[PDB]
Amino acid sequence: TPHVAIIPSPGMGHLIPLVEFAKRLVHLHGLTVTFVIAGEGPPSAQRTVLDLPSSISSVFLPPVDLTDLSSSTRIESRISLTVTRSNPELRKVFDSFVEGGRLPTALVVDLFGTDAFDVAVEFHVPPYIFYPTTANVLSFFLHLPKLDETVSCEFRELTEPLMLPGCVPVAGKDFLDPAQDRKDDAYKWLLHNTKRYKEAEGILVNTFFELEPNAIKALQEPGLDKPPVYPVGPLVNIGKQEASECLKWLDNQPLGSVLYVSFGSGGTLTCEQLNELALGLADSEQRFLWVIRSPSGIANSSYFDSQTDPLTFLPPGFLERTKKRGFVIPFWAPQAQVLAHPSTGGFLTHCGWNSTLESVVSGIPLIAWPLYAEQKMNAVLLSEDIRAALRPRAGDDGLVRREEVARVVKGLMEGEEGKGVRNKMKELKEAACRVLKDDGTSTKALSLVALKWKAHKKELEQ
Numbered sequence: 001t002p003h004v005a006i007i008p009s010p011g012m013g014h015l016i017p018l019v020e021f022a023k024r025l026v027h028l029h030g031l032t033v034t035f036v037i038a039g040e041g042p043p044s045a046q047r048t049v050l051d052l053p054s055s056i057s058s059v060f061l062p063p064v065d066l067t068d069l070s071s072s073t074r075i076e077s078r079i080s081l082t083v084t085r086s087n088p089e090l091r092k093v094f095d096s097f098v099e100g101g102r103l104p105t106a107l108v109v110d111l112f113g114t115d116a117f118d119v120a121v122e123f124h125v126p127p128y129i130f131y132p133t134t135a136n137v138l139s140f141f142l143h144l145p146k147l148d149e150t151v152s153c154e155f156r157e158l159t160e161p162l163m164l165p166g167c168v169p170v171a172g173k174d175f176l177d178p179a180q181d182r183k184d185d186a187y188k189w190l191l192h193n194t195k196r197y198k199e200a201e202g203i204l205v206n207t208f209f210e211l212e213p214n215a216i217k218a219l220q221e222p223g224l225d226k227p228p229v230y231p232v233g234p235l236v237n238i239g240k241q242e243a244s245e246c247l248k249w250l251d252n253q254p255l256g257s258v259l260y261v262s263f264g265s266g267g268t269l270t271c272e273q274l275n276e277l278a279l280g281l282a283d284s285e286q287r288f289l290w291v292i293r294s295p296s297g298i299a300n301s302s303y304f305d306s307q308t309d310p311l312t313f314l315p316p317g318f319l320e321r322t323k324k325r326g327f328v329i330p331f332w333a334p335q336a337q338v339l340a341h342p343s344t345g346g347f348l349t350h351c352g353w354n355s356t357l358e359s360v361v362s363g364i365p366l367i368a369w370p371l372y373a374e375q376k377m378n379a380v381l382l383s384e385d386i387r388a389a390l391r392p393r394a395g396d397d398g399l400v401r402r403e404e405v406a407r408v409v410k411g412l413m414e415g416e417e418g419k420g421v422r423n424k425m426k427e428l429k430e431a432a433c434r435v436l437k438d439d440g441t442s443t444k445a446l447s448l449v450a451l452k453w454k455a456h457k458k459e460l461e462q
């Protein structure tokens, strides 16, 4: 059977969907999978995630040396270089696969891991990309080499939004974070990765037709140097695994009553914003379950990570006033289970794509609160095109004040404002089931890829 090697770039939001993808490959397609894990140190959260059928093994590479990098290095530079600098160790793993008679049939990287294609090419292994965010942002990535060549200003200076075929228009000032400073190595690494996308034999994207129909149709049209694109989503943890205290609390709340609040694996708010969010959550008088992290002036400061107790940053009396109706859990919650719980009724999200897809699969409507990466692009898609998220108004200083927090929370949970988004999520919840049935469009697309891999292995071995 074909052996698929998967090399994630750092980040829980890369590993989680890749593990769901691997599980479908082994269970539904009979393939074998090895994760090759690059990094800086032992896995965190990560181990809970990698802890799987026998058909899935994990190899942890020796940690890469990133000690030459400035403390102010942006995350995408760190993420990309973790994979690039791991190539010599990845080659050693591939030599071990050759010796064991299990040369991979495919090497799957994620959106920042394209330098591992060097190893794939050396070993005559087809390179693929598993793209863990939207077809809209994939379109942006595929177009970036051309955009870079044709546009010479910082993107925030663009007066017209970018309107790629089938895509929601996005202002230059809202392009993903690593695109916002073209002089920084984060842009250099983003651009470099995008220029390698044309080398992929296929790109599997964690989205589905009904969610992004116009962008998927455009991506699948033949184009210059464009690989085949396969929507295979939503590949998520559906939340049926046994976790505890926050779920026990949830069990005691009415159907559809609780607002879950979470800023992904890496997100933090500023002090001032943390304060206004807490105050506005209390003011709203809604039930809530908030995964809290200590504040920072850097929005993705927890990406790789807490020492301090986040509860110490809450305002006077907040924990007291919300002792019954709010549950505040530091650092990490069993998010899949929360979103699948019948007592959950809404989600204030940073618009990371895994969180969005988990919410879609359970029909939970959103308040879009983007922080870093491509989240603002996702917020525009969710609120202006898909229409499954409400957005809070930030003042000219960037702060969402407590009055606005309370307004949008009540709008989502009880208001006329939230009816449209709740209905759209109901329809998307159905569609998410449709596309994953045996002859649903996402199952068909993944099956085409697995069939290609089975054919390739058959030809090689005969």
Ligand SMILES: O=c1ccn([C@@H]2O[C@H](COP(=O)(O)OP(=O)(O)O)[C@@H](O)[C@H]2O)c(=O)[nH]1
Residues within 6 Å of the ligand: 011, 012, 013, 014, 016, 262, 263, 264, 265, 266, 267, 291, 331, 332, 333, 334, 335, 336, 351, 352, 353, 354, 355, 356, 358
């Ligand atoms: O407290 C938390 C926060 C995050 N997650 C999971 O971590 C992933 C976060 O990925 P996402 O794409 O939403 O954002 P990122 O962390 O990459 O910014 C999702 O699968 C979440 O369910 C979780 O289980 N508990």
